[PDB]
Assembly symmetry: C3
Homo-oligomer: 307 residues x 3
């Protein structure tokens, strides 16, 4: 695959060099030709990307997204010179779709611990912000929403990388606990702050899943860190308390209810699987099971006014 | 070796920052210094490029050409501010010969099957086009010749990498043959479209050599794909037929005949070598030889009208 | 550690797009926010860099320095566009601190022979020059100090890589010694020319250390080349002779004296250790030791003119 992706890069390079030639010579039919070329690239690239997400290779998907960005960049240059609304609508649609797709991939990359690809994904996301910002600087709230999602992902990377460093460095389980506790608290305060300004339903849905995936990664790494059953329990309880409190902000609707549910259920499943793997006695399994059930009871009772 | 080339890069970038300093300070002698330093880079880079021309390390050749591009770019900025012709005369000639040389390297890379370096080279060629169009935006025929050669090389790379992907997937011989046939058909039609505009004699030789190298790569890949002796024979005759058709559609001098028919005979020799290696019965070897000799007769009987 | 460093890169890219956004909206509050965040990035990177200085991992230090320069770019954009002199001051200070640090690191990299990192460092030094040049293009004396040091480093690296290339391709020790003498003479000429312009004590400290490290590299490379004791003596005397002459130029003060002799003594100690390791006879050990003591006797005699 990669060489075909690089042929798209060469076509986009030739289009960009052609777009300098069009800026210098002024032929509107040359702008039409590079617009057609860039759409054909955009098709080829989206086909490779939709294949890549079915195949599960995130590196290929991120390469394809960066090509979609590069194609969107020259489309934005053509739209900036020509003033054509069809190109502006296409670029906005493609970029908004790419933002959602890269967000899904970023959730995957953080949830699967492949933070190197997540860093590349955030890099691509910044370029998507450049595309969106060049497309409409006045329609600012969508940029503010994207930047909030980015700040949330950055906060998740800060917690993730701080803990990954601590995992390499072999610190005491009590230091690992206090760092994870501090991390989950800081994540709560950031989620609370973001929830002041955001209002896109899908953005809130994304944000909750990101908070959940960050907590899940923190617990999985802490458990791979060989912590005591007592640490595993206290951290799981704190994580349930966070997931519950952030759900009491975000659980506005059937989707956000079902999302908070699936997340708390996933956290319970993970907690129990780790308690089984360490061989913790049945009372700790009961205590965690109760905490999970009681959290879902609280959320479904709390949300019962909204439906 | 590469560290030498990196010292040239550091020299060029120091010159480039010195050319920002020259744009801010206005000193003619500073422009004269960076111009001289860039010619000293051109000396050093040309010298290593001649070494690579002998030794066949294409990666070094491309690296040296990239330095020649970088040097030409700063020379173009120096000359565009200073208004001097001699730096533009040097840049134009150096770029034109570098374009031919990188095309010859790219033909070699396609013939060797290192499409990775060929892609990198084609990017360098597109960057030579940035130098060319910055040198003059109205020298359009040279830019058109470059773009035509580029699109031919891309069409060849698309056919090549598609068929190599069929080799990686383990596709059936009949599908492999339909893709190879489609590739030759598309190449023939593109070459006929290009023949409506191009008028550099060496560019016509380049185009024929590219079509021939693409057919050669297709033949070698189809042989590695394990196609039957009958399919190899049908491909060989169809390929020679296309090569004969393209030879008639391009050739316009006895020297162009010498080149084209030498290339045809080379492809026929490879076809015979493949049938010999596969152990195909002598009647198939005769059939291919007859087709080759009939192409010789036809291109003789056509070519004797050009002279 | 590279995850943390790349996290800082993402913070910087997010800030850079935020600095596009702040220039599109026209609000100083976001410029304060990116300035704050960039200063925290600078503190984080500086902390990692001084840590890397203690650990001895030059690749991490150079990565961190490039991040400091990347942060300095967005800081310089804010300090240029908002016009706040306290940002200009903090940027200029950070850039000058980085310049000294990267020069000392580059001297270390040359002294250890890891010239790949020295090339990267010198690239970063070009980036520091971009920051300095954008900060104040009329600060011409500081710019000239950086240029002179750069020219010296480039000349030293040219000799170094010429000699390493000669070792890599193979040569008779006679040609290696003839190149080494030509290198020491080029170093003498360039150092003499630079010493006509430069005045700063830190610049003297840098310059002599670089010349000394270049002689040290030349000597250690001839030792890796396995040259006979006669060639080792001949280069040792000529190298001490150049170091003595360059000391007679640069030794303006007790500090520059102290440096020059410490370096000379080190070069002699290396020379005697190579005579010890190659098993040179006791009379040759004495002859070289006497020559070294006579160089000390000359640094004593000459430097006392300024006591």
């Amino acid at each position: 695959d990669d060489l075909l992706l690089k042929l798209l890069e060469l076509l986009v390079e030739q289009a960009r060099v052609s777009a300098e030639f069009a800026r210098r010579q002024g032929d509107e039919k040359m702008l039409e030709e590079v617009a057609r070329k860039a759409e054909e690239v955009a098709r080829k690239a989206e086909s490779i990307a939709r294949k890549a997400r079915k195949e599960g290779n995130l590196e290929l998907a991120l390469k394809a997204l960066e090509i979609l960005v590069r194609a969107a960049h020259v489309l934005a240059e053509i739209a900036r010179e020509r003033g054509n609304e069809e190109l502006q609508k296409k670029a906005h649609k493609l970029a908004k779709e790419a933002l959602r797709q890269v967000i899904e991939i970023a959730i995957r990359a953080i949830q699967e611990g492949n933070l190197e690809l997540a860093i590349i994904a955030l890099h691509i996301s910044v370029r998507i912000a450049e595309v969106l910002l060049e497309t409409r600087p006045d329609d600012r709230e969508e940029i503010r929403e994207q930047q909030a999602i980015f700040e949330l992902l950055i906060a998740a990377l800060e917690a993730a990388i701080r803990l990954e460093k601590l995992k390499e460095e072999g610190a005491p389980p009590e230091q690992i606990e206090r760092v994870a506790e501090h991390g989950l608290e800081r994540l709560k305060e950031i989620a609370k702050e973001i929830s002041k300004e955001v209002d896109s339903p899908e953005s809130k849905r994304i944000a909750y899943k990101i908070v959940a995936a960050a907590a899940e990664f923190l617990l999985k790494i802490l458990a791979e860190g060989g912590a005591t059953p007592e640490q595993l329990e206290r951290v799981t309880e704190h994580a349930l308390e966070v997931l519950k409190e952030v759900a009491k902000e975000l659980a506005d609707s059937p989707e956000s209810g079902l999302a908070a549910l699936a997340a708390i259920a996933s956290l319970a499943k993970l907690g129990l699987e780790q308690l089984k793997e360490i061989g913790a006695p049945p009372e700790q399994q009961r205590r965690v099971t109760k905490a999970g059930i009681e959290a879902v009871r609280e959320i479904y009772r709390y949300g019962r006014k909204l439906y």
